């Protein structure tokens, strides 16, 4: 057909973020692992919320943010993720659809309720997330819109999807459909503790070719091979997947393809407000560039631009025009 309905389909845990500031002692007092995604049950969610200061709500979900970012840039995006039939679910549905992302996953009931993450931003701008999965545990093969996967240049998913019980089945279904239709699969390693949990599974997805493009930050790449040697991590990840995009925070990023390396610089920041969404938006920029036929370096540049923008605001999805910024940057 070579007119394809979607550039990027993303699949992830559909989450509403609940965002507040705290001091670092707050994290110690509450045994929250700093800079990480901390899974919590319903009881702990109530407890942490009762200790949290006044907050702001914003639609989140790592892959949700990535899909929103692609649409913002001007690409055609779709999302699979499960919310509940509740007000948080309505908020999530509105936000992603209002950005121009195709989102048609039907809620299954009011319980478990829509996933939320209590995100605590410390003075350094680091974020520490405390996520109750709620309705995310219900995502499964029944939620795969086969025609959408078939009609999407790239299907991208979260490592985080290995926590709920049935999501991985949906992903395997996606990989089959995408590849039978000549499309590509991509994943993010998500979080270094997530990598600790599913290391063998993730390596298997890469080595079997179910995943073609892998996103990682330094911490995740190191965790993947249980090494403190970043150069080893880079060499191995390159051997394990067709393309790897490895972010290094303020040190930019490196794109790896076989023996090719392409290094990109980070944009010089005024002040880091909140790092929430940085990796998500790097992926939006990269995949937007990738599905527009841009060079790997230019994909990296677009990722860095989008990540740099998101970290200068509160909230995980840029409130400003990424396409406008990309035009100004000569990235177009």
Ligand X SMILES: Nc1ncnc2c1ncn2[C@@H]1O[C@H](CO)[C@@H](O)[C@H]1O
Closer Cβ to ligand CCc1ccccc1CO, 90 or 297, answer by number: 90
- Phi and psi at 27, nearest 5°, equal -65, -40
Q: Is 45 in the site for ligand CCc1ccccc1CO (CB under 6 A)?
A: yes
Is position 89 annotated in a ligand binding site? Answer: no
Angle at 318 between CA 313 and CA 324, to 5 degrees: 115
* Breaks in the chain listed by the residue before each, with C–N > 2.5 Å: none
Of 139-147, 160-168, 293-301, 310-318: span binding K ion (CB under 5 A): 310-318
Closer Cβ to K ion, 30 or 312, answer by number: 312
Is position 252 annotated in a ligand binding site? Answer: yes
Q: Is 280 in the site for K ion (CB under 5 A)?
A: no
Of 86-94, 142-150, 165-173, 296-304: span binding ligand CCc1ccccc1CO (CB under 6 A): 86-94
Q: Is 128 in the site for ligand X (CB under 6 A)?
A: no
Q: Which residue is nearest to ligand X (CB)?
A: 60
The encoded tokens of residue 74 equal: 């001007």
Residues 219-278 that bind K ion (CB under 5 A): 274, 276-277
Rounded least distance, CB 141 to K ion, Å: 33
Residue-by-residue DSSP string for 69-121: HHHHHT--EEEE----SSHHHHHHHHHHHHTT-EE-PPP--SSSPPEEEEEEE
* Options 8, 22, 37, 135; binder of ligand X; rule CB under 6 A: 37
- Centroid of chain to Cα 221: 16
Residue bearing tokens 């239709």: 181
Q: Which of 273, 263, 288 is nearest to 19 (CA)?
A: 273
Pairing of β 115-121 and β 37-39: unpaired
What is the rounded distance in angstroms from the CA atom of residue 10 to the CA atom of residue 78? 6
Query: 208 Cβ partners below 8 Å, 6+ apart?
Result: none
Is position 103 annotated in a ligand binding site? Answer: no
Q: Is 46 in the site for ligand CCc1ccccc1CO (CB under 6 A)?
A: yes
What is the rounded distance in angstroms from the CA atom of residue 109 to the CA atom of residue 139? 12
Residues 218-237 that bind ligand X (CB under 6 A): none
Is position 17 annotated in a ligand binding site? Answer: yes
Q: Is 61 in the site for ligand X (CB under 6 A)?
A: yes
When CB distances are held under 5 to 8 angstroms depending on the partner's kind, the choice from its own copies, K ion, ligand X, none that residue 274 binds is: K ion
Annotated binding residues for ADP: 217, 247, 249, 252, 279, 304
Binding annotation: 13, 17, 61, 65, 131, 158, 160, 217, 247, 249, 252, 279-280, 304
In the complex, which residues of this chain contact ligand X (CB under 6 A)?
A: 12-13, 15, 17, 37, 60-62, 65, 117, 129, 131, 158, 160, 163, 276-277, 279-280, 316
């Amino acid at each position: 057909q070579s007119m394809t309905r979607f550039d990027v389909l993303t699949v992830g845990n559909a989450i509403v973020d609940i965002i507040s500031r705290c001091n670092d002692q707050f994290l110690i007092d509450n045994q929250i692992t700093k800079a990480a995604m901390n899974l919590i049950d319903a009881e702990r969610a109530e407890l942490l919320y009762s200790r949290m200061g006044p907050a702001l709500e914003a639609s989140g979900g790592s892959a949700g943010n990535t899909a929103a970012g692609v649409a913002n840039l001007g690409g055609k995006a779709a999302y699979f993720g499960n919310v509940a039939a509740d007000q948080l679910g309505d908020i999530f549905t509105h936000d992603i659809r209002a950005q121009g992302v195709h989102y048609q996953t039907k809620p299954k009931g009011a319980f478990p309720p829509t996933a939320r993450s209590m995100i605590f931003v410390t003075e350094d701008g680091e974020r520490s997330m405390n996520t109750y999965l709620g309705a995310c545990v219900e995502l499964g093969p029944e939620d795969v819109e086969a025609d959408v996967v078939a009609d999407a240049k790239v299907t991208y998913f979260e490592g985080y999807l290995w926590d709920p019980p049935r999501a991985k089945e949906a992903i395997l279904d996606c990989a089959r459909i995408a590849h039978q239709h000549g499309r590509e699969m991509s994943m993010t390693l998500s979080d270094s503790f997530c990598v600790d949990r599913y290391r063998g599974e993730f390596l298997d997805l890469m080595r079997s070719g179910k995943v073609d493009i892998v996103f990682a930050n330094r911490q995740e790449a190191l965790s993947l091979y249980q090494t403190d040697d970043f150069e080893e991590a880079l060499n191995r990840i390159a051997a394990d997947c067709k393309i790897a995009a490895v972010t290094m925070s303020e040190n930019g990023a490196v794109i790896l393809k076989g023996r090719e390396r392409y290094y990109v610089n980070a944009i010089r920041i005024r002040e880091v407000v909140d790092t929430t969404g940085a990796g998500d938006l790097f992926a939006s920029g990269f995949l937007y560039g990738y599905t527009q036929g841009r060079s790997l370096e230019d994909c990296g540049k677009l990722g860095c631009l989008a990540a740099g923008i998101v970290i200068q605001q509160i909230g995980p999805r840029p409130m400003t025009s990424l396409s406008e910024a990309a035009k100004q940057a000569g990235l177009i």
